[PDB]
Structures are given as structure tokens and as C-alpha cells.
Amino acid sequence: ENLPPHIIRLVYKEVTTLTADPPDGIKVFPNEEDLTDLQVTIEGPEGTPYAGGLFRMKLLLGKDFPASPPKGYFLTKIFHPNVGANGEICVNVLKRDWTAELGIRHVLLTIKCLLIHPNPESALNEEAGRLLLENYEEYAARARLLTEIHG
Ligand code: NA
């Protein structure tokens, strides 16, 4: 398409490998019609305020993938410093150490890991970031309540 044939091949193969052998806690649900839009679920890790939740999310392979990371959104509502009001996952965090040799597997691991260790210094959710830093117990409680409803 607007993606080079070698990127198409590499994406399709990497998505197949993710269907068969995903990171623990992660499942992928490829769309046969749009290679560029990938639905994913991530289990809220134990030992975090997201424990027990199943978080639906999607990746959109934009203009400049793999020069830039895919765009990520949580579809499951969440109270997390790095997730904005439309469910967008902070681009600046996803871009840390990004190079074009990275792919979908790294993006999904980075998101899963972000549930365990948020980065409130790059807060899209200003209140989440503030509470995490100033009153963690209240951050955790808000996040646990939302996880009970939405996860
Ligand atoms: Na962090």
C-alpha cells in the first residue's frame, strides 16, 4: 500500500508470530481486511492497581511505521498517567529508544510494562500523574475502582 512491500511482509509475519507466541498476558486478534489496525488485549498485571482487568487496546500502523512507533489506544477505560482522554498512549514514552528495527512485539511489551511502572513525568492524565507522585494510595484506589468497572 503506502507501506513498502518488505514492511508488509515483515508486519504480516510478525503478527503471525504474535498470534502463536505472544508475550505472557498479551493476546492479538488480527483483522484479515486491515493489516494496519491490530486489536490486542493485555491482562492487568498482578501486583499493580490494574490486577485482574483485561484491557482491550488497538495499534494503528501510521504514515511512518516503522520509522515511528504505531499509534496506540486503550479501548478499555483506564486511569493511568500516560493514557489521555481519548485513550491515546503517550507517543513520547513509546518513542523512547525507538528505531525502525523495532516492531509490534516491542510496542506491546512496552505498554504491558507501563501498567506496572507508569511514567508520571509524561502525563497525559494530569490528575493521574499528580496523584501517583503525591498520594499513591489514592492513585491506586482510583485505578482499582475503574479496573473493577471496566476490566
Ligand atoms: Na516510570
Curated annotation (Swiss-Prot):
UniProt record, GO biological process: anaphase-promoting complex-dependent catabolic process; cell division; exit from mitosis; free ubiquitin chain polymerization; positive regulation of ubiquitin protein ligase activity; proteasome-mediated ubiquitin-dependent protein catabolic process; protein K11-linked ubiquitination; protein K27-linked ubiquitination
Record note on quaternary structure: Component of the APC/C complex, composed of at least 14 distinct subunits that assemble into a complex of at least 19 chains with a combined molecular mass of around 1.2 MDa. Within this complex, directly interacts with ANAPC2 and ANAPC4. Interacts with CDC20, FZR1/CDH1 and VHL.
N-terminal signal peptide: none
Purpose: Accepts ubiquitin from the E1 complex and catalyzes its covalent attachment to other proteins. Catalyzes 'Lys-11'-linked polyubiquitination. Acts as an essential factor of the anaphase promoting complex/cyclosome (APC/C), a cell cycle-regulated ubiquitin ligase that controls progression through mitosis. Acts by specifically elongating 'Lys-11'-linked polyubiquitin chains initiated by the E2 enzyme UBE2C/UBCH10 on APC/C substrates, enhancing the degradation of APC/C substrates by the proteasome and promoting mitotic exit.
UniProt source species: Homo sapiens (Human)
Location of the UBC core domain: 6-151
Record carries keyword tRNA processing: no
Keywords, comma-separated and alphabetical: Acetylation, ATP-binding, Cell cycle, Cell division, Nucleotide-binding, Phosphoprotein, Transferase, Ubl conjugation, Ubl conjugation pathway
Residues the record marks as active site: C90
Annotated metabolic or biological route of this protein: Protein modification; protein ubiquitination
EC code(s) of this entry: 2.3.2.23
Effect of K112A: Reduced ubiquitination activity
Protein name stated in the entry: Ubiquitin-conjugating enzyme E2 S
Effect of C90S: Loss of function
Cellular compartments per GO CC: anaphase-promoting complex; cytosol; nucleoplasm; nucleus
Key word Transferase present: yes
This protein's encoding gene: UBE2S
Catalytic activity, reaction form: S-ubiquitinyl-[E1 ubiquitin-activating enzyme]-L-cysteine + [E2 ubiquitin-conjugating enzyme]-L-cysteine = [E1 ubiquitin-activating enzyme]-L-cysteine + S-ubiquitinyl-[E2 ubiquitin-conjugating enzyme]-L-cysteine
Protein family: Belongs to the ubiquitin-conjugating enzyme family.
Molecular function as annotated in GO: anaphase-promoting complex binding; ATP binding; ubiquitin conjugating enzyme activity; ubiquitin-protein transferase activity
Post-translational modification comment from the UniProt entry: Autoubiquitinated by the APC/C complex during G1, leading to its degradation by the proteasome.
Residues of the full protein shown: 6 to 156 of 222
